[PDB]
Amino acid sequence: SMTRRNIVGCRIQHGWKEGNEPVEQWKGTVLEQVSVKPTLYIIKYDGKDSVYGLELHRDKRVLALEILPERVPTPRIDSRLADSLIGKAVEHVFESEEGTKDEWKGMVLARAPVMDTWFYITYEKDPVLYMYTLLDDYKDGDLRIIPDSDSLVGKQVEHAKDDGSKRTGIFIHQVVAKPSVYFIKFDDDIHIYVYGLV
């Protein structure tokens, strides 16, 4: 039979219809096909720095999915300087009114697949997976490295909610630099949760 191109590593476009809200147009890059759940894909969408998980060929909210006739950009960064951030605890500084501090404590986890100049990062105030070109903020002083403060992948898990109901989730990735940290995808949420952070 004819073999179609793998959607991983491509630029994609699709409409998004969530219930009765107006239809939106989403554009992004497919970073990974989850080995332990091949229907699930990991995507970085333009303008959204929280990474998403979607069963792109099954989910009824995804409309007219297509591969764009574009190449995924391939910029370069200094390899040694990028690896110096991996596994480190950081303070990420954000713009705010003068005489007011807006900083978030977090941890740099890995260089992302496909978009290797972007980095996976998690925070204490928001435990979902984020992605950003952190070396831009590190060189400008807006990211500070702070002193020093066998895998569940594939295993299913259940969560007992406040109301009378349960939800299933699956461990999808083990962070190589910090093997006690994992990524979980629950079937009722598009965000990727970060588990095992202190």
Residue extents of the structural domains in the chain: 11-67, 79-145, 156-195
Query: Could you tell me how far CA 34 lies from the centroid of its own chain?
Result: 13
Query: What is the resolution in angstroms?
Result: 2.0
How many other β-carbons are positioned within 10 Å of the β-carbon of residue 26? 19
In degrees and rounded to multiples of 5, residue 122 shows phi and psi of: -125, 160
Q: What backbone torsions phi and psi does residue 136 show, to the nearest 5 degrees? A: -65, -45
CATH of domain 79-145: 2.30.30
Q: Is residue 171 within 8 Å of residue 192, measured between CB atoms?
A: no
Which residues are 52's β-sheet partners? 43, 191
Give the span between the Cα atoms of 119 and 159, in whole angstroms: 29
- DSSP 3-state assignment of 44? strand
How far, in Å, are 17, 38, 60, 117 from residue 67 at the CA level?
A: 19, 18, 18, 22
